Design a protein around this ligand. Structure first.
Ligand SMILES: [Fe+3]
Ligand SMILES: [Fe+3]
Ligand SMILES: [Fe+3]
Ligand SMILES: [Fe+3]
Ligand SMILES: [Fe+3]
Ligand SMILES: [Fe+3]
Ligand SMILES: [Fe+3]
Lengths: 174, 174, 173, 173, 173, 173
């Protein structure tokens, strides 16, 4: 019945990876929607779009790595519907960063509980895997997104329209 | 209020793109699933997996180009749920190619009707856009999957053991 | 009388090319006027000048390619006067971008009508020629101009001083 | 049963491609004959021969590119006899160019008939395939051949001796 | 009020530069009409068109430089209609060279009058500008067009049709 | 009536070359049929396709060299209809090789008769021409196709599915 490679891999941990894979693919789809917003003619911020397009592809990459982990440990992949993002119009550059900040913190919460579940079942490989390739990256993203909000707020976006334009050119342009 | 860049871009075409975007994103999620199936330890065909992963990212690329088209013509993007693949287990190498063959014909089928619509609304830009970047790619990709199914069939897949193993090395290896 | 190389080229289509050849040359002259407005000392926006001068050269290049299409298909070119632009002063960078957008949209409306006639006279080469080299760039340029107008509106041009100046260095530079 | 890759590909389109294939091969054979004529010791125009040899191999490629299309869409390649050229002695450099001009307009006419068949059966892939790789090249080859005739006529060929000799070196060489 | 940069720049000179700008744009637009003529399938002189297109682009660059002068000195550019060429059919290469020689001499005439105008108003910058970038160039152009008209006559154009063909390859190639 | 270059070139040998030209053009056509067959979606052997397409073009090179031979010896090229291949469906990789083997032996027989006839008429140049560029080349093609026929039979083609698929990669790739 079980996979020939399976060893110290609980069936609950297997299910939480399938949930995370879906939650990672959900993140990718949200960031893709954001990118499209800033590429609109009535928004027209290419480096906001380019930034969020890059973030979308990393989430696609994060989803694929869990799928490889699932198969590595002997667990089987089962995919669900990827839900559409909560909103289509994201208003402005600032709001998108704040929705993204919340999105990454939600993903981080799912990973922490996943790591908590991995610890409870004495799964040190899965605890190492989440520690190395995910928890560090989420802390880095959450801090980065927090910085972008901190500056945009100070600059006076979105009321002062010259704020988001100058952010797009300097911070996201290099 | 409406798009200042909009011109001769009928509102049904705008909607037909939104459904076409979801179709290309679906196809990517179908290919992603297939790639991971051959990555399982009880299937273990590396170049089958690597092949379908490439097809998935091309279907992702195709979706993003339609999303760019939507913004170019002054349309507005509205996203739906990306539905899961009809099955989780893809039986064998031959079967996945046959499922991919049929999938591409459904994607092409939609594009033809999208061209038919675009021709009836007298939109030469959207007609040439589909002609240039999609109909050529679909006919080429269907022919390719037709060739693979043939070779895997003649070789005796999947009951004959070396059929898919040798095909993974020779044809899908390079 | 008819040319040795003439085949499936309707006389209505032939004349429609010459009208377009004039419209492309007119668009070039409009863009040359715009470019010079920013070259003025009391406007002094050097990248707005480079931008519209480049568009002025490409509209000439578009006009040159339509002329080449006329001779390829055996039709005869008949040039008309080139009209002057409807205004000399363009006020600001934003206003010039908004005018340019309407110009490109009006040129596209001429190209769309030209494609219609080709379909109604069963000329597939002429339809392809317009599709391949013209409609693609119009939508692309229109979209680009739409972006420039959107950004400038939000920044607060032309009444906010640094709006157009900074746009000059960042987007156009 | 039909092919596994077949979709929106009519029976008349499939069969029209087979005729179009034989036409391109026939044209290749015509150009091949022209080329070998100028290699004769009593004609001896090397760049006339090398020019028409080049047009022979490009037709062969056009014929091979249709066969590629035939297999992609799920149709099947039925071949036919390639008819010998209507004449062997092409007389002069001017006459061969006039005969090639006629031949290229005939092939272009057949591709136009093929396009409206593809248009009638709502096959946009076959319409684009013809638009992209054939119609545009046929207009160029007809125009190119027309230009060559026009010069040779003004030079005074074939009565004028150095007309075809110098055209060989300058325009073709 | 006068521009901040305006100094020793008379309004008649300002107005005459704008009339010159139009004449430079007219000169350009004439050359393009010539270029289009030689690209025709019944004329088919490739380097003739090459030559006349080059002159069109240079006359365009001459006008753009005169516009830059207008803004440099403080003047303001007022554009006018660019009149169409006084004929559509240019008949021959020899005739187009004679019409071009005629054109350049007329443009030189205008600049000679623009120079004395500047001389009268004691404008040493504008006198130098015209001497440096225009008067020397117009004499060079007229001399070159003199040479081609001369060479084309002595060769026997346009009755000997091989003459214009060989002048296309050897002098303009 | 006799060509200025012609010497020791019997008119039977001239007529025989014209038949060989047609036979080489036939052989080129048969290979083109075979190549296209393996490019079908339901066959899908891309290197078999490449192998026979290469032979088709080398048969055209053989034909063209014979056409150059004809003009060198003052003979005149008279072209006939290129007959269509005996079949459209070539069945399998094995069958195509055996048909190719039969074709190369048919062509070789026609060459040996052409050489025999050339030896009867004491035409030592024509004998050497067929020895140097055709006879030695044919023996190789027949030997090479002999190997491919043997290996496919040994592997158990086409009944064993992997036979021709694997032969496609290792031998022909
Ligand atoms: Fe993630
Ligand atoms: Fe796709
Ligand atoms: Fe344009
Ligand atoms: Fe089209
Ligand atoms: Fe052709
Ligand atoms: Fe000038
Ligand atoms: Fe041979």
């Amino acid at each position: 019945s079980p996979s020939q490679v399976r060893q110290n891999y609980h069936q609950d941990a297997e299910a939480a990876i399938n949930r995370q894979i879906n939650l990672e693919l959900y993140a990718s789809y949200v960031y893709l929607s954001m990118s499209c917003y800033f590429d609109r003619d009535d928004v027209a911020l290419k480096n906001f779009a380019k930034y969020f397009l890059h973030q979308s592809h990393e989430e696609r990459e994060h989803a694929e790595k869990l799928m490889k982990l699932q198969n590595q440990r002997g667990g089987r992949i089962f995919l669900q519907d990827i839900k559409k993002p909560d909103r289509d119009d994201w208003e402005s550059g600032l709001n998108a960063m704040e929705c993204a900040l919340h999105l990454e913190k939600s993903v981080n919460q799912s990973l922490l509980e996943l790591h908590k579940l991995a610890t409870d079942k004495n799964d040190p490989h899965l605890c190492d895997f989440i520690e190395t390739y995910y928890l560090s990256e989420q802390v880095k993203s959450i801090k980065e997104l927090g910085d972008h909000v901190t500056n945009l707020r100070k600059m006076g976006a979105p009321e002062a329209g010259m704020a988001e334009y100058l952010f797009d050119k300097h911070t996201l342009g290099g």
